[PDB]
Design a protein around this nucleic acid. Structure first.
Ligand code: MG
Lengths: 106, 97, 95, 87, 95, 106, 82, 97
DNA sequence: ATCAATATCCACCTGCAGATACTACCAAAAGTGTATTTGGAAACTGCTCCATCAAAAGGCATGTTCAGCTGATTCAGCTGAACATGCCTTTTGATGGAGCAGTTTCCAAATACACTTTTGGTAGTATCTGCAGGTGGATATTGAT
DNA sequence: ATCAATATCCACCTGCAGATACTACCAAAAGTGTATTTGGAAACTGCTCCATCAAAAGGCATGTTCAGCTGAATCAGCTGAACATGCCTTTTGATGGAGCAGTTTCCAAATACACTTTTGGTAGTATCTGCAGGTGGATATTGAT
C-alpha cells in the first residue's frame, strides 16, 4: 500500500488534511484533490519560511532556529509579513529600526 | 566625573532591546494585575501559567507596536518626545476609537 | 491519555530538505505548528465561503485554488498554486 | 481555604522602568513624564478586553481555570492572533 | 424566476410594531436585510467555534448566548440575552 | 398547526433560522432552542435600529426611513456604532462634525 | 483632448470628498497622492472581486463579487445584497 | 464687487456635503477607472451596473473616512492643511503601509 | 457701530418615482408524525499542574543635576481659496444582443461501509549537543578638552 | 585632533537544559477494496440587463489675485535623562492537593424519512402618495466701511 502523500509527492500528510477538512465542517463534501492541493500549499509555505528562518539562524551563527529567527524571517519578507500581518510570534522581538531624526549630530 | 549626554544611553537602550526578545515587564507584577482584573470579572478563577504567559507576550507585543505608532506620531509633530496626545492620535486612527 | 496531533514531524522533514544541518527549538516548532494550523483554517474558510456563494456542496481543489489566490499575496500565491496544481496533477495519474 | 489576600492597585506594578524598556523596544528616544500613567491606562483597557473574552470561553467550558487556549482564542477573536502558546 | 429570500417582511413587521406610522425606503430595507444576514453569520460563526473548542457536535442556545456575549457591546449584549432567553422560555412553555 | 415563531412570540422566522443553521455547516447538530434564541436576538436588534432610525426620520420631519436615517441612528449610538464599526452603510453619508480648531475666530 | 482615466477623478471631486471628510484646507499635492491611494484601494478590491468572477466562470463582475471582496478586505458594505 | 474670505466657502462646503449623501465622483470617469483596473486582472469583462455602484459607494466611503484621519494628523502637527505626509501617516498607522 | 449683497430658512405647491396594497399560483418551505441514531451529562477516579510558600538573587525608587527639548513669538513669503463661464465631458434615455440563469440530464466521482495494514504519538529509559552566560582580554564609541 | 573612561565586541569555555535517540507497544489513523448515491458539468435557450450612442444637460478647467497660513529663526524656562545611592521585591526551586480530563455507562433529544399543509415570493395589474424640487418672501451671515 502506497500513502496518498507519496502518490502526490508530498512530505505533508494528505490523509490528515483530508480528515481535518471533514470534521472541520466547511462543506458537505470534500473532493479528492482538495486535500492534495491544500497539503501542497501547506507544505510549500512552511518550506518557504524555514528556508528564510534557517538563514537568520546562520547569519546569527546559531544551529537551531528559535522564534527570533522565525520572526526575523517573516518580518524581513514582504509577502510573508503581509500574510502574517495580524499575527504575533511569541518571543520573536522586533526588527532593529531607529527613525533617522533620533540619531545624533546632523 | 564622567557623564553621557542626554539621548546617548537612550539609543544604547534601543539598540539593546530591539536586539533581545526577553519580556520586559516583570513576571509576578504582571501576574498580579491579570489576576486582579480577571477577579473583577469573576471570582475563584485559576490561571494556567502559560495563560498568563500568553497574555504577557500578547500585551508587550501590543504595547511595543503601539510605541512605534506613537513614536511616528511625535515625529510628525516635529518632536522626538512621545506624549499622551501621540498615543491618543495613534489609537484613534487605529480604530481603537 | 489523549493524543495531541501536530505537523511537527512533517515540518521537521521539510526543514531537513532545505537545511539538513539545522535544528529547531521546540518553541519555534510550536509556532511553526500554529502557522500551519492558522493557514489551514484560513484557506479552508475561503474555500468554505467560496462554495456557499456558488451553491456548491463540495470543496474541490479548484476551491482550494481560488481560496489560495484570494488569501496569499502576489508571488506567494503564484508559487503555491503551481505546487498545488503540480501535486494534484501528479496525484490524478498515480493510481 | 484559610485566607486569600486582597488584590488592589497592581497596575502600579507596571513600573516606570518596565514601560520605558517597552518604549525603547518600540524605538522611542524621549518619554514625557505623563506617558507612564497613560500607558498603564491603555494596558488596562487591553487586558480587560482580552480577559473578558478569555473568561467567557472559560465559563462556557464550565471550567474554573483560564487555559492558555482560552487566551489564544480571545486573542484571535479580537484580531490579535498569537502563535507559540498552543493550537 | 428562482426564489430570492429576504428578511424584508419580518423587518417590516417589526418596523410597524416599533413605529406604526413610519415606512422604509427600498434601499434602507436592503441595508436592514444585509444587517440581519451579517449578525446571523457572526453569531452562528462564533457559536460554531465555541462548539469545536469544546468538542461538541451540537449548536445549542447556550452556544448562541455565549456567542452573543462575545460579539455584542455591554447593554446591547445584556438586552439581547434577555430577549434570547425570554423567547426560548415562552416557546418551551407552550404545548 | 402553529408556527414556532408565534410560539416564541417572535416576528422573525424560527423555522427559517433553524433551516439556515443546519445548511450553514456550523456544527453536526442544531439544538431545538438555538434558532428560537437566535431569532429573538436578530429580531431585538432589528427593532433597536428601526427604533432609532424611526426617531432619526422624525427629527428630520420625515415618515420614510431612507439609508441616511439608519446611518444617523447607528453612528450616533455608541454601542450600535461599535457593532457596525467596520461596516459601511451605502448612501449614508457622515455625521455633521467640524474640528473646533478649524472654526472661524469670533 | 486625450486624458488619463485616473485623472478623471478630478480636483473638484477629490475636494468634495475631503469636504465631507471635514477638511478645510488642502495642499495642492494631495490630489495626486489621493489618486494614487484610490488606485491601491481599487486594485486590491477589484482583484479579489474578479477572482470571484473567474471562479464562477463568468464574464460579468456581479455586485456580490464586489460585496464579498469588500467583506474579505474587511470593508463590509450594506445595500447591494448579501 | 463682493468676495468671501478663504476658508469661508470651505466651511460652507464642509457643512453642505456632510448634510448630503450623494456620491461625489462623477459616475462615468469613475466607471472607466474601475474597468481600466480590472483589465489587468481579466480581459473582456463586463460589470453589473449595481456592482460599479457598490465599488463607488465603498471607495468614496473609504476615502472620506481617510480624510478624517488625515485631517486629525494635520491638526496634530499643529496645521490646518492636509498634506501628503498626513495621508501617509494615517495610512501607516492604519496598517495599510 | 450701518449697510448691502447673498446665503439660508421656511411655508406652500404638486407630478410622479417609488412605495404599497391586491389576486391567483404553485413550488417550495415549514410543519406534523414515527422510526432511529446518537451526543453529551452523570458519576467516578487517575494524575497533571496550580496555589502557595521559603530561600536566594537582582532590578527598583529616589534626589539631584542641568542638557537640550518644547513651545511661544515673531515674521516673511509662498501657496492654496476664491472668483465667473462657455467648453466639452458626463448624464440621460433608446435600443440592439451578450450572457447570466433556469432547465434537464447522466456519469465520474462523491459517500458508505467493512476488514486489513500502517503509523504517528508516548512513554519509559537512554545518550547527545547547542548554547547560555561566565571569564578575560583585545577594539570601539563617546565626550571632556 | 588626543587622551581616557567605559561600552562593545569576540572568542573560547565548561555545565547542563533542552533536544535528540530507540525501544516498546498500541489505539487510532489511513489504507484498500467494493457496493451505492448523486453533485454539478454540460448542453441548450430565453430574456434580462448591459455596452453603446444621440442628444440633453450642467460641471469644471482655466489664470488672476492676495488673505492668511506654513515654516524658519530665535530664545526663555524647565522637563526629563543620567546617575548615584540605598534596599525591597521578584525570582527561583520545592511540596500537598484542587480540578481537569480520561473512561464508562445511560437516556432525552436530535436526525431521518414520508406525508399534509402552509407561507412567502413573484407577477401582472392597477392603486397610492411622500417628498424632492420649485417658488416667494422673510431674515441671518458675511464683509466692507
Ligand atoms: Mg478587585
Amino acid at each position: 500500500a502506497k500513502t496518498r502523500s507519496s502518490r502526490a509527492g508530498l512530505q505533508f500528510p494528505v490523509g490528515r488534511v483530508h480528515r481535518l477538512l471533514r470534521k472541520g465542517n466547511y462543506a458537505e463534501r470534500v473532493g479528492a484533490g482538495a486535500p492534495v492541493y491544500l497539503a501542497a500549499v501547506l507544505e510549500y509555505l512552511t518550506a518557504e519560511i524555514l528556508e528564510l528562518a534557517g538563514n537568520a539562524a546562520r547569519d546569527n551563527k546559531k544551529t537551531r532556529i528559535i522564534p527570533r529567527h522565525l520572526q526575523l524571517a517573516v518580518r524581513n519578507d514582504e509577502e510573508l509579513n503581509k500574510l502574517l500581518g495580524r499575527v504575533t510570534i511569541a518571543q520573536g522581538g522586533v526588527l532593529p529600526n531607529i527613525q533617522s531624526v533620533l540619531l545624533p549630530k546632523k | 566625573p564622567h557623564r553621557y549626554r542626554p539621548g546617548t544611553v537612550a539609543l544604547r537602550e534601543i539598540r539593546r532591546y530591539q536586539k533581545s526578545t526577553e519580556l520586559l515587564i516583570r513576571k509576578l507584577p504582571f501576574q498580579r494585575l491579570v489576576r486582579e482584573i480577571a477577579q473583577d470579572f469573576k471570582t475563584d478563577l485559576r490561571f494556567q501559567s502559560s495563560a498568563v504567559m500568553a497574555l504577557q507576550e500578547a500585551s508587550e507585543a501590543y504595547l511595543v507596536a503601539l510605541f512605534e505608532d506613537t513614536n511616528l506620531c511625535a515625529i510628525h509633530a516635529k518632536r522626538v518626545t512621545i506624549m499622551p496626545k501621540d498615543i491618543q492620535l495613534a489609537r484613534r486612527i487605529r480604530g481603537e476609537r | 491519555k489523549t493524543r495531541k496531533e501536530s505537523y511537527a514531524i512533517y515540518v521537521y522533514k521539510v526543514l531537513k530538505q532545505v537545511h539538513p544541518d539545522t535544528g529547531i527549538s521546540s518553541k519555534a516548532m510550536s509556532i511553526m505548528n500554529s502557522f500551519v494550523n492558522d493557514v489551514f483554517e484560513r484557506i479552508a474558510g475561503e474555500a468554505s465561503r467560496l462554495a456557499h456563494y456558488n451553491k456548491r456542496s463540495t470543496i474541490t481543489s479548484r476551491e482550494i485554488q481560488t481560496a489560495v489566490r484570494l488569501l496569499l499575496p502576489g508571488e506567494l500565491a503564484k508559487h503555491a498554486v503551481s505546487e498545488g496544481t503540480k501535486a494534484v496533477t501528479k496525484y490524478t495519474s498515480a493510481k | 481555604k484559610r485566607h486569600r489576600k486582597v488584590l488592589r492597585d497592581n497596575i502600579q506594578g507596571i513600573t516606570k522602568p518596565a514601560i520605558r524598556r517597552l518604549a525603547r523596544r518600540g524605538g522611542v528616544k524621549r518619554i514625557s513624564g505623563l506617558i507612564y500613567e497613560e500607558t498603564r491606562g491603555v494596558l488596562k483597557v487591553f487586558l480587560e478586553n482580552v480577559i473578558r473574552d478569555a473568561v467567557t470561553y472559560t465559563e462556557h467550558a464550565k471550567r474554573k481555570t483560564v487555559t492558555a487556549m482560552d487566551v489564544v482564542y480571545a486573542l484571535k477573536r479580537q484580531g490579535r492572533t498569537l502563535y507559540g502558546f498552543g493550537g
